[PDB]
């Protein structure tokens, strides 16, 4: 009802098509005494209308927010499933390849020590799943016992009761060391990465449940439907206006920025540790190759030991493609918590525009990101001394996981 008409027709139709009584709409433009939210002036909105539209806009913002969150959560979840499943498959496939090829290559050497290898793979598996062990001692034990058994089997003629320190003549060659280093780096790398994906996923899932405040509700009502109430339903909110409003509403969520970026940075970094620097494939799916090399070494050092007294890394593999895609997706969503207002405004709510008093230009500067930066926010009045607890706990989770990944990166 501008341009020389006070008829509330369009406000009536819009308010009605939104599932509210058409009877509640005043026939013509009335006095605005009653308005709790919209600036007091001549309006087509009654109390019931204002409240209803407030509820509507609030619910709409909620829907948008949880939709975006749902997208992000879906992405992280699919990433998690993909990487976990692929690491497990690499290990399992290594084991199957060993079981299938070793009897031909080594015969009784392998077949009478199969449980040793199976046990080693089970230990590696437990180690990946997070059970608290480490490979140095486990592999050391493995190689000790394996050397014992293999030496016994090589020499049925001599009965050998017990303490063979002839080792570190390196009967198995360099393979035990290579396996030690590579497995130590790669498996904790993989585990920490997967753990990081899990943590990010849980953080998003939990943050999504943080409710919008009353201040935010009123500011959003003012942002969206106060244009309708003040006689300009065709008017749409100014981008910077919308952005200040949402920055006011989503300050707590925006406080996750620093630690989210830290976590995602360390997660991008840790993927490098999946491989070595020598142009060799990942040990996570090629343990059997090093085992086989160790056994070959032992065989061709059988005489010498007796003393009584790794295929090149493919240009592209599954893991590498997965890592590229993952790094793309993670670099893409590192800005999430502060990009929320911009994207939510750009997509849905937001060239002469509604500044919240009237149609026109919106002067005020866009606020910075984060709770503290909203102390002066003109559109939303936010108390900065009252942070949300859920957000804080999630930030702690991000801190912890990040530390885990930095340590994992170092070792
Ligand atoms: C790897 O093998 C274990 C042991 O049977 C199994 O539980 C797990 O589902 C397998 N993972 C795969 C096939 O991705
Ligand atoms: Ca982005
Ligand atoms: Ca203030």
From Swiss-Prot:
Main location group: membrane
Gene Ontology molecular-function annotations: copper ion binding; fibroblast growth factor binding; laminin binding
Effect of substituting residue 55 to Q: Protein yield reduced by half. Protein yield reduced by 90%, abolishes N-glycosylation but no effect on secondary structure
Glycan-modified residues: 55, 92
Domain of life of the source: Eukaryota
S-S bonds: 8-44, 38-226, 45-229, 216-249, 238-353, 242-345
Processing and modification events after translation: S-nitrosylated in a Cu(2+)-dependent manner. Nitric acid (NO) is released from the nitrosylated cysteines by ascorbate or by some other reducing agent, in a Cu(2+) or Zn(2+) dependent manner. This free nitric oxide is then capable of cleaving the heparan sulfate side chains. N- and O-glycosylated. N-glycosylation is mainly of the complex type containing sialic acid. O-glycosylated with heparan sulfate. The heparan sulfate chains can be cleaved either by the action of heparanase or, degraded by a deaminative process that uses nitric oxide (NO) released from the S-nitrosylated cysteines. This process is triggered by ascorbate, or by some other reducing agent, in a Cu(2+)- or Zn(2+) dependent manner. Cu(2+) ions are provided by ceruloproteins such as APP, PRNP or CP which associate with GCP1 in intracellular compartments or lipid rafts.
Membrane topology: Lipid-anchor; GPI-anchor
A GO cellular-component term linked to this record: extracellular region
GO terms under biological process: cell migration; heparan sulfate proteoglycan catabolic process; myelin assembly; negative regulation of fibroblast growth factor receptor signaling pathway; positive regulation of skeletal muscle cell differentiation; regulation of protein localization to membrane; Schwann cell differentiation
Keyword line: Cell membrane, Copper, Disulfide bond, Endosome, Glycoprotein, GPI-anchor, Heparan sulfate, Lipoprotein, Membrane, Proteoglycan, S-nitrosylation, Secreted, Signal, Zinc
Locations listed in the record: Cell membrane; Endosome
Involvement in disease: Associates (via the heparan sulfate side chains) with fibrillar APP amyloid-beta peptides in primitive and classic amyloid plaques and may be involved in the deposition of these senile plaques in the Alzheimer disease (AD) brain.
Role description: Cell surface proteoglycan that bears heparan sulfate. Binds, via the heparan sulfate side chains, alpha-4 (V) collagen and participates in Schwann cell myelination. May act as a catalyst in increasing the rate of conversion of prion protein PRPN(C) to PRNP(Sc) via associating (via the heparan sulfate side chains) with both forms of PRPN, targeting them to lipid rafts and facilitating their interaction. Required for proper skeletal muscle differentiation by sequestering FGF2 in lipid rafts preventing its binding to receptors (FGFRs) and inhibiting the FGF-mediated signaling.
Family per record: Belongs to the glypican family.
Protein's name in the database: Glypican-1
Gene designation per UniProt: GPC1
């Amino acid at each position: 009802p501008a341009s020389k008409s006070r008829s509330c027709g369009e406000v009536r139709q819009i308010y009605g098509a939104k599932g509210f009584s058409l009877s509640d709409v005043p026939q013509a433009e009335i006095s605005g005494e009653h308005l709790r939210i919209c600036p007091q002036g001549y309006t087509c909105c009654t109390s019931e209308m204002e409240e209803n539209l407030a509820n509507r806009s609030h619910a709409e913002l909620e829907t948008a927010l949880r939709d975006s969150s749902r997208v992000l959560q879906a992405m992280l979840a699919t990433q998690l499933r993909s990487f976990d499943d692929h690491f497990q498959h690499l290990l399992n496939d290594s084991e199957r390849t060993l079981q299938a090829t070793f009897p031909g290559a080594f015969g009784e050497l392998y077949t009478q020590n199969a449980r040793a290898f199976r046990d080693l793979y089970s230990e590696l598996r437990l180690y990946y799943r997070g059970a608290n062990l480490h490979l140095e001692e486990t592999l050391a034990e493995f190689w000790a016992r394996l050397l014992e058994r293999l030496f016994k089997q090589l020499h049925p003629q001599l009965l050998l009761p017990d303490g063979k320190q002839a080792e570190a003549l390196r009967p198995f060659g360099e393979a035990p060391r290579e396996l030690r280093l590579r497995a130590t780096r790669a498996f904790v790398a993989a585990r920490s990465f997967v753990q990081g994906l899990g943590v990010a996923s849980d953080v998003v899932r939990k943050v999504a449940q943080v409710p919008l405040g009353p201040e935010c509700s009123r500011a959003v009502m003012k942002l969206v439907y106060c244009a309708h109430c003040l006689g300009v339903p065709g008017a749409r909110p100014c981008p910077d206006y919308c952005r200040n409003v949402l920055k006011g509403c989503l300050a707590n969520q925006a406080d996750l920025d620093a630690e989210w970026r830290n976590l995602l940075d360390s997660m991008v970094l840790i993927t490098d540790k999946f491989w070595g620097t020598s142009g060799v494939e990942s040990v996570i799916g090629s343990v059997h190759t090093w085992l086989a090399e160790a056994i070959n070494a032992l065989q061709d050092n059988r005489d010498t030991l007796t003393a009584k007294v790794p295929r090149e890394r493919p240009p592209s593999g599954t893991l590498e493609k997965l890592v590229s895609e993952a790094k793309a997706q993670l670099r893409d969503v590192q800005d999430f918590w502060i990009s929320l207002p911009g994207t939510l405004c750009s997509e849905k709510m937001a060239d002469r525009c509604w500044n919240g008093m009237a149609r026109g230009r919106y002067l005020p500067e866009v606020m910075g990101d984060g709770l503290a930066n909203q102390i002066n926010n003109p559109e939303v009045e936010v108390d900065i001394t009252k942070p949300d607890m859920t957000i804080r706990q999630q930030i702690m989770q991000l801190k912890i996981m990040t530390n885990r990944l930095r340590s994992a990166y170092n070792g």
